[PDB]
Amino acid sequence: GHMINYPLASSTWDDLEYKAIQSVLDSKMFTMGEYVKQYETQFAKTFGSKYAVMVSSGSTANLLMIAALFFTKKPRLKKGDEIIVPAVSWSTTYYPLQQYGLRVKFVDIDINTLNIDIESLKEAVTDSTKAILTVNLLGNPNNFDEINKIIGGRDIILLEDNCESMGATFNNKCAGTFGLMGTFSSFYSHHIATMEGGCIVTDDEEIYHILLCIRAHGWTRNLPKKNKVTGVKSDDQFEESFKFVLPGYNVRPLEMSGAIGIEQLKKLPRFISVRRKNAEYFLDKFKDHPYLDVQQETGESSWFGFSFIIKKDSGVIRKQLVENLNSAGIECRPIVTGNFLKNTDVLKYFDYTVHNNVDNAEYLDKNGLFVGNHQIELFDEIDYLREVLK
Amino acid sequence: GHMINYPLASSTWDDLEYKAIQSVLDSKMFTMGEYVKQYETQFAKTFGSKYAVMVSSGSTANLLMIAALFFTKKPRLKKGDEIIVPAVSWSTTYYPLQQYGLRVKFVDIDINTLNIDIESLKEAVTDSTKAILTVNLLGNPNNFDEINKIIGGRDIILLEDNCESMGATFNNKCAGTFGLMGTFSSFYSHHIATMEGGCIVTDDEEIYHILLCIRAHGWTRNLPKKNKVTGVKSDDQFEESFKFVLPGYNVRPLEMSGAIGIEQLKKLPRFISVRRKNAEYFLDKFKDHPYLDVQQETGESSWFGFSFIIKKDSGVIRKQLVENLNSAGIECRPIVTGNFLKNTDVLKYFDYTVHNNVDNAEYLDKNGLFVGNHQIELFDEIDYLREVLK
Ligand SMILES: Cc1ncc(COP(=O)(O)O)c(CNC(CCC(=O)O)C(=O)O)c1O
Ligand SMILES: Cc1ncc(COP(=O)(O)O)c(CNC(CCC(=O)O)C(=O)O)c1O
Ligand SMILES: [Mg+2]
């Protein structure tokens, strides 16, 4: 089976977005400008954060997020610092840690939530832990309350990779706003899509400043006269426009993406709505499934897609399932990357350690799968899927 | 709101580019794909390189260019390794060196060509030198023949930042193809423009493959069955498609840029021809300027723009010239960034050293200025310029 009728991805666009590109074309201004800024403003508003910075991708968002910590007047991070992460996530969640010389401490996930295992996190955290980098998997937010209990008020930075859970909420607060900084992705087929695109949110003005700076050449052009980076900008452009203060990058997003994001954000409430209705329907259909477990929701998940974990001693073979789905026209993939720890070749480059074991991650790596969720009603696709997975 | 008699920049697009953008819309495939691939083939073919890798910007081309060196089966670079660079260039030429923990050795420029001072280089090179990162300034190529004499068999890697000199040639050879790798930029107002964009060229297959991997998640999806990173790609999709082997990034370009890029390459030759003809005229007008020195051409420059250095013992103050230019409706700027070494703040982060001195760079910093060159005839503009600069 190779004929796909129930795909993982689909378009979130309509006329409005095409018109938006048009507006850009007419403007003949393609470099990051007005729209990006407007986009950022609404973005922060939408999620309930003070600041938001748009970047080229969710991956680059992650990059700047980590980097930023090295540049505070009083650097918040230092080479060799210990950072805790879950064993399951996207590759670019981990790379920047390596690229910045951090010591990475891996923590197993919770088999029901798919998020970091709270119990293990409990023990994993020590006096050496400088930061915790959480990942809201597949739309499901982490239990921040519990996380917070662990920190117990210490000076441990909390960070969030919210690339898969835009719109998710916990305790009424938007996922991605819990940490010092939160990242998002607007890549094709995410809660929203801007072709390629990412964002970083924060309530910290210094960090905010740093970001603006590191996003583009390490210059002061995007900074305000009075800023937390250089204090006060010289009034001499010949000089001013040509000074570099931080070792940054060029990860500016395109104006087009910004203009598109604007249209997309307006639709967000509806997208979340549909996705959630679909999930409700799904949970109901798969409630007592004989050999598959579904993701256990925390707070209000933005249900990026649907995960399945073959029940222990169910004798079910992932391979057949997959075959079966495909033959039926259902597209499927591993749960993200599966157990990240399997990537031995890339790990060679990391300075890392594993807390305890990553048993659950290993199980998932072998018995997990996932099908798409859309901002479109999938009742019928769901009935069929249930039919197939008998 | 403009009111410019002589702009630094201009658009290089016509209906063709707009047409290309339309074509992509219609295709509904916005993520890097066919167009990008077509572009790369055309690109390599155009400059005489075996391979080309399109990236999100010239800046990221640079980044990947440095990074790739650490991933060869037999790593070409390691932390602490010494790399030589000229004192004048864009900030993104430098950051990656810092980001990879290399030991930076700044070398002064030649006040005439504006490129690295060949004589100092000779002196700067030691057995500790691992690589030389050259920069082709403002369209002017370096004298590779001499540099080559300098390397004299030794195992020193030659690199090129060709972001300002697309189209330049030396000894019948295209700038960017001299070093193991070469970087290019297609940002607004370059020789070609794709909104944002970069490219890396190479004749090395292993490097080529490394680049393919790190550009996009450090995965294998863009790698051939038989490739130099993993050797042979599994046939199992649910597995092979989710494997990470190198710590890269997500610096993919948009399918759109590649589409635009395709059209731009065709126009490239004329663009170059027009700029060179402008240069020819400019030179005749300024060749014997009483107080201004012009750029000394090496090989066949692609004349990115027109540089001027106030002659020593002239009694002419830069500040006053700028004022005049400006009141005259003539846009001017510093030569690139000027003396990079003046950037004390950002230097704090570097492991660097300065060979001898950067007197030339310091001179240029206080005495140089730059005016635009375009792919449109500027006869009248040049005349006016000469009039203002009486
Ligand atoms: C946990 C996590 N972090 C970061 C990212 C990435 O953001 P971005 O894609 O804009 O770099 C993703 C999404 N991962 C992917 C991989 C697919 C792809 O980018 O081709 C996604 O955005 O779909 C992710 O799931
Ligand atoms: C030597 C050199 N390296 C790298 C770059 C950068 O390529 P890119 O800009 O696509 O990241 C430039 C151009 N420098 C500038 C600064 C102006 C700007 O980016 O707004 C250019 O793109 O013209 C450069 O001159
Ligand atoms: Mg004319």
The secondary structure of B176-211, three-state, reads CCCCCEEEEECCCCCCCCCCCCEEEEECCHHHHHHH
**Contact of A171 with A144, CB cutoff 8 Å:** yes
HEC-encoded secondary structure of chain A? CCCCCECCCCCCCCHHHHHHHHHHHHHCCCCCCHHHHHHHHHHHHHHCCCEEEEECCHHHHHHHHHHHCCCCCCCCCCCCCEEEEECCCCHHHHHHHHHCCCEEEEECECCCCCCECHHHHHHHCCCCEEEEEEECHHHCCCCHHHHHHHHCCCCCEEEEECCCCCCCEECCEECCCCCCEEEEECCCCCCCCCCCCEEEEECCHHHHHHHHHHHECCECCCCCCEECCCEECCCCHHHHCCCECCCCCECCCCHHHHHHHHHHHHHHHHHHHHHHHHHHHHHHHHCCCCCEEECCCCCECCCCEEEEEECCCCCCCHHHHHHHHHHCCECCECCCCCCHHHCHHHHCCCCEEECCCCHHHHHHHHHEEEEECCCCCCHHHHHHHHHHCC
A77-82 long-range Cβ contacts below 8 angstroms, 24+ apart: A77/A102, A77/A130, A77/A131, A77/A157, A78/A130, A80/A351, A81/A130, A81/A131, A82/A126, A82/A128, A82/A129, A82/A130, A82/A131
Q: Is the CB of A179 under 6 A from ligand 1?
A: no
Task: Give residue A114's Cα distance to chain centre.
Answer: 14
CB atoms within 10 A of CB B298: 22
B242 and B359 inside one domain:
no
Cα diameter, chain B: 74
Residue with tokens 């840690």: A97
**Contact of A76 with A271, CB cutoff 8 Å:** no
Pocket of ligand 2 (CB under 6 A): A 250; B 57-59, 62, 89-90, 92-93, 135, 161, 163-164, 185, 187, 198
* Angstrom distance (rounded) from CA B135 to CA B176: 9
* Angstrom distance (rounded) from CA B191 to CA A355: 53
DSSP structural state of residue B113: T
Last residue of a domain, one of B266, B286, B302: B266
Q: And the tokens for A372?
A: 């798409």
Count Cβ atoms within 10 A of the Cβ of residue B240 and give its class: 0-12 exposed, 13-18 middle, 19 or more buried.
Answer: middle
Provide the residue count of chain B.
390
Rounded to the nearest angstrom, the distance between the alpha carbon of B385 and the centre of ligand 3 is 13
CB atoms within 10 A of CB A206: 17
**Contact of A222 with A189, CB cutoff 8 Å:** no
User: Taken in order A206, A54, B250, B340, is the CA torsion positive or negative?
Assistant: negative
**Contact of B165 with B138, CB cutoff 8 Å:** yes
Give the type of residue at B172: N
State whether residue B145 is helix, strand or coil: helix
CA distances from residue B11 to B188, B189, B193 in whole angstroms, order as listed: 8, 7, 8
* Angstrom distance (rounded) from CA A271 to CA A168: 12
CB contact under 8 A, B99 and A95: no
Give the type of residue at A130: K
A28 and A74 inside one domain:
yes
A176 and A320 inside one domain:
no
* Angstrom distance (rounded) from CA A317 to CA A314: 9
B187 and B272 inside one domain:
no
Q: And the tokens for A61?
A: 């968002």
Task: Report CA dihedral (A42, A47, A49, A54) to the nearest 10 degrees.
Answer: -60
B231 CB-near residues (< 8 Å, 6+ apart): none
A45 CB-near residues (< 8 Å, 6+ apart): none
The residues pairing with B333 across neighbouring beta strands, listed in sequence order, are B370
Give the type of residue at A384: Y
CA distances from residue A54 to A295, B6, B72, B342 in whole angstroms, order as listed: 30, 33, 33, 30
> Taking each helix axis from N to C terminus, what angle separates B205-215 and B58-71, rounded to the nearest 10 degrees?
120
* Angstrom distance (rounded) from CA A292 to CA A298: 19
B288 and B171 inside one domain:
no
* Angstrom distance (rounded) from CA A166 to CA B148: 53
> Which one of the listed residues A190, A191, A209, A374 is annotated catalytic?
A190
B92 CB-near residues (< 8 Å, 6+ apart): A217, A249, A250, B58, B59, B62, B63
**Contact of A67 with A56, CB cutoff 8 Å:** no
* Angstrom distance (rounded) from CA A212 to CA A205: 10
DSSP structural state of residue B4: -
* Angstrom distance (rounded) from CA B202 to CA B199: 10
Q: And the tokens for A303?
A: 């249900």
Rounded to the nearest angstrom, the distance between the alpha carbon of B243 and the centre of ligand 1 is 14
**Contact of B222 with B252, CB cutoff 8 Å:** no
Nearest alpha-carbon partner for B374 in B12, B16, B1: B12
Judging contacts by C-beta atoms under 8 Å, the chain A residues touching residue B323 are none
Give the type of residue at B121: L
> Which one of the listed residues B2, B190, B191, B374 is annotated catalytic?
B190
DSSP structural state of residue B87: S
Q: And the tokens for B209?
A: 């493959």
Give the type of residue at A309: I
**What's the half-sphere exposure (Cβ side, CA atoms, 13 Å) at B270?**
8
Phi-psi region of B201 (alpha: psi -120 to 50; beta: other; left: phi over 0): beta
**Contact of B368 with B307, CB cutoff 8 Å:** yes
**Contact of A172 with A144, CB cutoff 8 Å:** no
Q: And the tokens for B388?
A: 């203002």
State whether residue B330 is helix, strand or coil: strand
Best probe residue, ligand 1, of A162, A187, A200, A373 (max atoms within 8 Å of C-beta): A187
What angle (nearest 5°) sits at the alpha carbon of residue A196, between those of residues A191 and B239?
80
Distance (Å) from the alpha carbon of B217 to chain A's nearest alpha carbon = 6
Distance (Å) from the alpha carbon of B353 to chain A's nearest alpha carbon = 17
A295 and A204 inside one domain:
no
A290 and A259 inside one domain:
no
Last residue of a domain, one of B232, B266, B300: B266
> In chain B, which residue ranges form alpha helices assigned H by DSSP?
15-27, 34-47, 58-71, 91-99, 118-124, 144-151, 205-215, 237-240, 255-286, 318-327, 344-347, 359-367, 379-388
B54 CB-near residues (< 8 Å, 6+ apart): B32, B36, B39, B40, B43, B197, B198, B199, B253, B257, B258, B261
Rounded to the nearest angstrom, the distance between the alpha carbon of A306 and the centre of ligand 1 is 17
* Angstrom distance (rounded) from CA A140 to CA A151: 21
A68 and A131 inside one domain:
yes
Judging contacts by C-beta atoms under 8 Å, the chain B residues touching residue A254 are 195-196, 254
Task: Using the CB atoms, write b or e for A230-259: b if 16+ within 10 Å.
Answer: beebeeeeeebebbbbbbbbbbbbbbbbbb
Task: Give residue A204's Cα distance to chain centre.
Answer: 20
CA distances from residue B128 to A375, B108, B155, B355 in whole angstroms, order as listed: 58, 19, 10, 13
Q: And the tokens for A102?
A: 């951090």
* Angstrom distance (rounded) from CA B334 to CA A5: 58
Nearest alpha-carbon partner for B242 in A195, A358, A89, A2: A89
Last residue of a domain, one of A238, A266, A294: A266
Count Cβ atoms within 10 A of the Cβ of residue B285 and give its class: 0-12 exposed, 13-18 middle, 19 or more buried.
Answer: middle
A349 CB-near residues (< 8 Å, 6+ apart): A98, B247
**Contact of A30 with B186, CB cutoff 8 Å:** no
CB contact under 8 A, B254 and A196: yes
CB atoms within 10 A of CB A75: 11
Query: For position B13, which CATH number holds?
Result: 3.40.640.10
B227 and B284 inside one domain:
no
> Taking each helix axis from N to C terminus, what angle separates A205-215 and A58-68, rounded to the nearest 10 degrees?
120
Q: And the tokens for B299?
A: 């090989």
Judging contacts by C-beta atoms under 8 Å, the chain B residues touching residue A255 are 195
State whether residue B299 is helix, strand or coil: coil
Q: Which contiguous run of DSSP H or E holds residue B310?
A: strand B305-310
Count Cβ atoms within 10 A of the Cβ of residue B149 and give its class: 0-12 exposed, 13-18 middle, 19 or more buried.
Answer: exposed
Among protein residues, the one with the nearest Cα to ligand 2's atom 25 is B90
Among protein residues, the one with the nearest Cα to ligand 2's atom 2 is B90
Distance (Å) from the alpha carbon of B268 to chain A's nearest alpha carbon = 20
**What's the half-sphere exposure (Cβ side, CA atoms, 13 Å) at B127?**
0
Count Cβ atoms within 10 A of the Cβ of residue B361 and give its class: 0-12 exposed, 13-18 middle, 19 or more buried.
Answer: buried
Pick from A218, A256, A345: which is nearest to B91 by CB?
A: A218
CB contact under 8 A, A92 and B249: yes
A257 and A348 inside one domain:
no
CA distances from residue A349 to A108, B96, B351 in whole angstroms, order as listed: 21, 18, 22
A220 CB-near residues (< 8 Å, 6+ apart): A213, A227, A229, A230, A233, A240, A241, A243, A245
Nearest alpha-carbon partner for B198 in B215, B214, B184: B184
Q: Is the CB of A177 under 6 A from ligand 1?
A: no
Count Cβ atoms within 10 A of the Cβ of residue A92 and give its class: 0-12 exposed, 13-18 middle, 19 or more buried.
Answer: buried
Judging contacts by C-beta atoms under 8 Å, the chain B residues touching residue A29 are none
* Angstrom distance (rounded) from CA B306 to CA B294: 8
B370 CB-near residues (< 8 Å, 6+ apart): B8, B138, B305, B306, B307, B308, B332, B333, B334, B335, B336
Query: For position A317, which CATH number holds?
Result: 3.90.1150.10
HEC-encoded secondary structure of B342-390? HCHHHHCCCCEEECCCCHHHHHHHHHEEEEECCCCCCHHHHHHHHHHCC
CB atoms within 10 A of CB B75: 10
* Angstrom distance (rounded) from CA B55 to CA B360: 33
Pick from A249, A322, A350: which is nearest to B63 by CB?
A: A249
Task: Report CA dihedral (B226, B232, B238, B243) to the nearest 10 degrees.
Answer: -100
Rounded to a whole number, what is the distance in angstroms from the first to the last CA of chain A? 18
A72 and A202 inside one domain:
yes
Judging contacts by C-beta atoms under 8 Å, the chain B residues touching residue A252 are 57, 196
* Angstrom distance (rounded) from CA A92 to CA B17: 33
Residue with tokens 């579904």: A294
Rounded to a whole number, what is the distance in angstroms from the first to the last CA of chain B? 28
Task: Give residue A151's Cα distance to chain centre.
Answer: 22
Residue with tokens 């290399």: B102
The residues pairing with B107 across neighbouring beta strands, listed in sequence order, are B86
B374 a catalytic residue:
no
What angle (nearest 5°) sits at the alpha carbon of residue A289, between those of residues A286 and A294?
60
B301 and B189 inside one domain:
no
DSSP structural state of residue B329: T
DSSP structural state of residue B53: E
* Angstrom distance (rounded) from CA B137 to CA B116: 9
* Angstrom distance (rounded) from CA A131 to CA A158: 6
* Angstrom distance (rounded) from CA A123 to CA A35: 46
CB atoms within 10 A of CB A39: 27
Distance (Å) from the alpha carbon of A58 to chain B's nearest alpha carbon = 8
Chains A, B: CB pairs < 8 Å? 137
Task: Report CA dihedral (B321, B324, B330, B333) to the nearest 10 degrees.
Answer: 30
B343 CB-near residues (< 8 Å, 6+ apart): A243, A244, A245, B91
- Between strands B292-293 and B305-310, the pairing is antiparallel
**Contact of A302 with A167, CB cutoff 8 Å:** yes
Count how many domains chain A has. Answer: 2
Count Cβ atoms within 10 A of the Cβ of residue B53 and give its class: 0-12 exposed, 13-18 middle, 19 or more buried.
Answer: buried
Nearest alpha-carbon partner for A8 in A378, A338, A384: A378
Q: Which domain holds residue A338?
A: 267-390
